[PDB]
């Protein structure tokens, strides 16, 4: 995260770290959506142009964390993967369309002050909150510019779709939205390398619960003026999420 701040303890208890087994290292962010299901970006697991293809056994999930490097005895929990599911129409070839994947855990994690699932939006929350100008929050342990001691947080406003489109040569779809300040705005900030797969969340003013509206997906550079971060639109792919969780329990 660029131009963010130190998270408070327990401020993001759904945050998941995707950690490489050997050599042991941060791979990506992700989020806890029930006691056995973790949400992330498809490209964190599968991206052939970088010869990236991970399997279950290459990985572990670390939940409850705050420090990037430290092993947080008595606080974090570490989980093994039972099965990775990637969207059947994830477009890694052209633009990362439908950049989303689920990870099912071998065993349920135990909830605690530091571990708790975020909500997934219904159509009415989505319609009410996904508006240009509304701010969401992104969290993660990636670079501070183009690595932090602890989880970083930044609040960023959703950007009008014509401005998203005009900021890039990539073909933008309805399965994405972009977020960030304009140059004209003073304030800045952005996701960066290692933040991918983490959550974009909003707090509903209707029921005071946190909803995950986006997944950190891509950007050109980090925190460049006139460019914006792109997020997978979670509500738009929920049928597939639901589907996957239904059948695979």
């Amino acid at each position: 995260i660029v131009e963010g701040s130190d998270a408070e303890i327990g401020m993001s208890p759904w945050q998941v770290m995707l950690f490489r087994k050997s050599p042991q290292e941060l791979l990506c962010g992700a989020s806890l959506i029930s006691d056995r299901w973790v949400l992330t970006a498809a490209h964190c697991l599968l991206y052939p142009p970088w010869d990236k293809n991970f399997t279950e056994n290459d990985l572990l999930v670390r939940i409850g964390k705050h420090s990037r490097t430290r092993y947080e005895r008595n606080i974090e929990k570490i989980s093994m993967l039972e099965k990775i599911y990637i969207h059947p129409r994830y477009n890694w070839r052209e633009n990362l369309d439908r950049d989303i994947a689920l990870m099912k855990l071998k065993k349920p994690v135990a909830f605690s002050d530091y571990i708790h699932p975020v909500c997934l939006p219904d159509r009415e929350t989505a319609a009410s909150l996904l508006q240009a100008g509304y701010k969401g929050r992104v969290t993660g342990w990636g670079n501070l510019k183009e690595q932090p001691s602890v989880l970083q947080v930044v609040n960023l406003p959703i950007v009008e779709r014509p401005v998203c489109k005009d900021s890039t040569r990539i073909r933008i779809t309805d399965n994405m939205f972009c977020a960030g300040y304009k140059p004209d705005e003073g304030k800045r900030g952005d996701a960066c390398e290692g933040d991918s797969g983490g959550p974009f969340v909003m707090k509903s003013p209707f029921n005071n619960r946190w909803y995950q509206m986006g997944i950190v997906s891509w950007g050109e550079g980090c925190d460049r003026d006139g460019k914006y971060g792109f997020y997978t639109h979670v509500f738009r792919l929920k049928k597939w999420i639901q589907k996957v969780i239904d059948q695979f329990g």
């Binding site: 042991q24 290292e25 572990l60 490097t69 430290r70 092993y71 570490i78 690595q147």
Partner: peptide, 9 residues
Amino acid sequence: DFEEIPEEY
């Protein structure tokens, strides 16, 4: 740069 995890996991 990563404190190594218990062997267990």
